[PDB]
Design a binder for this molecule. Structure first.
Ligand SMILES: CCCCCC
Ligand SMILES: CCCCCC
Ligand SMILES: CCCCCC
Ligand SMILES: CCCCCC
Ligand SMILES: CCCCCC
Ligand SMILES: CCCCCC
Ligand SMILES: CCCCCC
Ligand SMILES: CCCCCC
Ligand SMILES: CCCCCC
Ligand SMILES: CCCCCC
Ligand SMILES: CCCCCC
Ligand SMILES: CCCCCC
Ligand SMILES: CCCCCC
Ligand SMILES: CCCCCC
Lengths: 5, 10, 95, 131, 131, 95, 5, 10
């Protein structure tokens, strides 16, 4: 995933 | 709340 | 990051359906949306996901996390406001 | 927002911009009243950050934007940084926002409110338009 | 740390624990002196969080740990949350840490210091041991 | 999260070599380490990566990000202290 | 990726 | 700095 952020 | 004075157009 | 404010309408998903993409990372305090050819991305975090209920725009989600490349066919994850609103009430009342 | 579209200036009056002291936009946030803005706890806000309201074009200098200072940061004590669960923080503005045509509040839901899968909602912000 | 090993109690005296008010460890940090701790800016620290020093076992109640309060959070103004670049924050303790056998500082490098690829270093903390 | 403090020694990598795993996300203010059968993970963030120089342990990196499942064959990314230390000096001196 | 964190 | 009174064992 990845933080938005 | 939740009622903009400038209406969004989508 | 674009200079002028962007917008996009997108559909809500159930957590179960969202589990198919994200598995166990999806918690009850999270709410998915997107996977619709549109996607929130880096810089949007903290922003709103609103739905119209009885004429008024209601904060349903807070931009949180999702695909690292912001792919539009995978659902973005937002903080589910309904599960956090009681805390919000308590905080406003006390401060 | 990837694949989004430019919004009508001031049509989402609760949307605010979180910018650090260098004038850098790093997170969005929503005004819930004239002293409170709601944002993601992961944004890691501090009191030196600034809340910008009444803004549409970040590159414009002719906008009557409101640069509000943060009095106190209220990170939800349930926020789990390992999982990013309960990702919400409340910021208390030291400078109360003045509401107008382009600055106002979003409505908060009742804890009991149901938002069905399939329902079309909308999201805004100044985040990347392409990765 | 995955595939790590338990350390000798107090052998990394600068390692501190960042815990929110519920007693939850969410980030590590390093003491650089008795009033300053260095941590990641993404940890999103606030003044309600607490810095724990002199700790080895989080589950022990018989440890002479030091629960230090944070006076001010100093997020590097270069920190880029979109890329997580320049991920450093300084915390100024309102309560100066007392140094001892188990509480002391790590050394900071000269901006010119070179650390060659291949060099064996070490990392510590109470992060997940398996995902 | 384990109760008692964990440790692991790991090798430093060059940014170029690290680019092979992480591409363009690796910036000059980042420094890689690991991919050695060991890996920092969620909860470690903010912690130290120290190297011994002239007898003393020196802060070289700050636990930052990396593989989402903390895989031990991919390198973890730490904040490169050398590129941030001048800012640290300025901050201590002023406050 | 993923933030550590 | 950098010299623990309790030496690390690796
Ligand atoms: C303080 C910011 C935390 C990481 C957001 C990408
Ligand atoms: C708080 C001023 C506006 C009320 C209706 C949205
Ligand atoms: C903007 C939503 C419709 C899909 C465009 C790819
Ligand atoms: C808000 C996104 C602008 C257009 C990207 C395809
Ligand atoms: C960033 C400000 C947008 C306009 C409404 C507060
Ligand atoms: C269970 C650790 C938090 C999520 C990391 C992908
Ligand atoms: C079209 C997205 C609007 C979100 C509320 C600011
Ligand atoms: C610090 C990690 C403990 C053992 C995990 C294999
Ligand atoms: C979390 C504290 C570890 C011991 C050295 C300050
Ligand atoms: C360029 C956007 C920040 C990194 C997201 C993977
Ligand atoms: C606290 C310095 C790191 C030690 C890892 C073995
Ligand atoms: C702990 C480092 C050696 C490799 C173990 C899998
Ligand atoms: C405030 C915490 C930001 C996200 C860390 C995983
Ligand atoms: C600051 C007390 C210890 C000095 C040597 C590491």
């Amino acid at each position: 995933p990845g933080a938005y952020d | 709340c939740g009622v903009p004075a400038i209406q969004p157009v989508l | 990051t674009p200079d002028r404010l962007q917008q996009a309408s997108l559909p809500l998903l159930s957590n179960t359906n969202c589990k198919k993409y994200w598995g166990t990372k999806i918690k009850d305090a999270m709410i998915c949306a997107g996977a619709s050819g549109v996607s929130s991305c880096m810089g949007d975090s903290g922003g709103p996901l609103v739905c119209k209920k009885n004429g008024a725009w209601t904060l349903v989600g807070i931009v949180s996390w999702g695909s690292s490349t912001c792919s539009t066919s995978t659902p973005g994850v937002y903080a589910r406001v309904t599960a956090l609103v009681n805390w919000v009430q308590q905080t406003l009342a006390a401060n | 927002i990837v694949n989004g579209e430019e919004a009508v200036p001031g049509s989402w009056p609760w949307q605010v911009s979180l910018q650090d002291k260098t004038g850098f936009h790093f997170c969005g946030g929503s005004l819930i009243n004239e002293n409170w803005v709601v944002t993601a706890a992961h944004c890691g806000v501090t009191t030196s950050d600034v809340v910008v309201a009444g803004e549409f074009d970040q590159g414009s200098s002719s906008e009557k934007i409101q640069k509000l200072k943060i009095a106190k940061v209220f990170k939800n004590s349930k926020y789990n940084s390992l999982t990013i669960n309960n990702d919400i923080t409340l910021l208390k503005l030291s400078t109360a926002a003045s509401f107008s045509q382009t600055v106002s509040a979003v409505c908060l839901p009742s804890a009991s409110d149901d938002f069905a899968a399939g329902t079309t909602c909308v999201t805004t912000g100044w985040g990347l338009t392409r990765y």
